[PDB]
């Protein structure tokens, strides 16, 4: 077929970079992060929508691998919050081990340059995102260390409110958008060069973040409110503010976000959503954000990671131009990552002060007096 | 003076790499890790034995900066252990920020090559070590992520027993050396390329670690038992096993480890200890491990980080050869780091299986059946 030949050509010309995949959490569920001697299963999985053979088959150029851990359910809030941090390091660890044990398929990337070098080598550019600020355990220091471990976006919430922002699915509202700490964290996220992800956050939290952010943001996996009314989808208001922000909405394959009855959801519905956003706010602000392995069953025609060529062909069939399809595939999310890094370099170049954690005093006045008294003795020498 | 000219020449020919300095914890004590607008104080500190002016003055070539946090004192052991992990990320964060805000003085290093490139650029090679396995919160995944954050040695204990090994100062003994988990962790530390540090560990724990380790280890800050009997000092037995191990004992400036009465401790005592070890197990297995800022007051002549030229001159004055002084200064610890990395590359090249954490089951049998049933449906398509 000519359109399938066209789709295959585009997939090798530019990387299709998917916004969100929970394959690392499936490894935690199935293997408990022990992948020693499990290559046969990692290439051909007995569960889930992602494995290394199907990943190759669908010609995916890059992937933001989710380092998601669940919202804390311990009655002791201190324990649950700290437990989420330990579990986050476990998920970051298995992601890095997955990449390092399969270097012919996966190659770690944390920038636009590293995405392209991975793609030109014939690897899936493997980036990392955390899904919720519950994962940092109220520690901006921890957040900066997650950036050093390779995390390049942070979803501000999952399906629970935190100290910084409100989730979409939980009611009633806690902060009514972003908190004071949330507003201050946006500045720090822009300063460090962490991409803001507005998926799972409330409509009001999106509006406030889109106005405040000095860098372009993403929706790593969200769809369109006007076509399908859901708390998780993006309103026309926030789509316009995303345009002003220079951000990208990466369209989700979640069946509940595409149709009123989930079993009616299709590949066509995903294309409807991409075209709606592309028509109204331009094709340079739309992406692909599957959320594969964040669901049991995908839409008809998008059942697993092998189905991306059908999506690329489907967009071309509906009259989306070759250049605009390349933008939707991956050039847009590359641009946002570029601009996030460029804004960070500008703010770090100017010497902007970083956000610090509020710590307890470890020394009393007696210890501090002994230290100053000791320093003065050394000055006399 | 000719000897002072000789000492100054050696300090610029090869890097003096100190094994242990707790300046990051002094920053936590004094500034609470908020160093924004504090350069005047960071160059000329009102407390402690380390600042950036005195660091330059003493001509130090490199430093393993300690990311120490105290042993957990919470009655809830789960909370205290997890709290130590969060505090570790805070200390790693302030170390990286200290280095990045002062790039003319400090340059991050995590290898022998990066030590030399830092030294040839005129910077203090800034490496990182954690002080106690309580800091990883019983998570080998976290430990690997600490390695990714730049940690290149792990002291197996501080002044508390943990799941892996016994501390020296605490009685009674818990494991009687290393535990089963401790023995297994030694293999993982060798595999990942993490340098083992035997300071603060019990005599029996040292003996077992020195026999088991496939890579050379260090004592980042310990002195000699035969000259001064203390639980923290190294016995003649363990000195010989260190020789077989190919490791390095980095001699400590702690006054309690050098003399029976602390106020009697001197620069001469430190030199006595270096010469004792150098005479008996060779000068290629001895280093310098100040423990500056792990004490209030240092020995007479070694009061702060500006005093290293007096130590180099003191060693030359006592008849230690120019080549042997260069070894003690830093070439030995560089060699150990080289060999630790070489052993890691060999074991990782062979494809040795990594140690994994024991995780809870997140899915029940019903969820696993739904997933396998879903996968089979996709296979039929
Ligand atoms: Cl290019
Ligand atoms: Cl930073
Ligand atoms: Cl704290
Ligand atoms: Cl050299
Ligand atoms: Cl590894
Ligand atoms: Cl767990
Ligand atoms: Fe997810
Ligand atoms: Fe999600
Ligand atoms: Fe220390
Ligand atoms: Fe110590």
Curated annotation (Swiss-Prot), chains A, B:
Q: Where does Zn(2+) bind?
A: 20, 22, 131
Q: Which Pfam families match?
A: Peptidase_M19
PROSITE patterns documented for this protein: RENAL_DIPEPTIDASE_2
Q: Which GO terms describe its biological process?
A: gliotoxin biosynthetic process; mycotoxin biosynthetic process; proteolysis; symbiont-mediated suppression of host immune response
User: Organism's domain of life?
Assistant: Eukaryota
Q: Does the keyword ATP-binding apply?
A: no
- Name the needed cofactors: Zn(2+)
Give yes or no: UniProt keyword Kinase.
no
Q: Which family does it belong to?
A: Belongs to the metallo-dependent hydrolases superfamily. Peptidase M19 family.
The free-text function statement in the UniProt record for this protein reads: Dipeptidase; part of the gene cluster that mediates the biosynthesis of gliotoxin, a member of the epipolythiodioxopiperazine (ETP) class of toxins characterized by a disulfide bridged cyclic dipeptide. The first step in gliotoxin biosynthesis is the condensation of serine and phenylalanine to form the cyclo-L-phenylalanyl-L-serine diketopiperazine (DKP) by the NRPS gliP. GliP is also able to produce the DKP cyclo-L-tryptophanyl-L-serine, suggesting that the substrate specificity of the first adenylation (A) domain in gliP is sufficiently relaxed to accommodate both L-Phe and L-Trp.
- Protein known as: Dipeptidase gliJ
Q: Taxonomic lineage per UniProt?
A: Eukaryota, Fungi, Dikarya, Ascomycota, Pezizomycotina
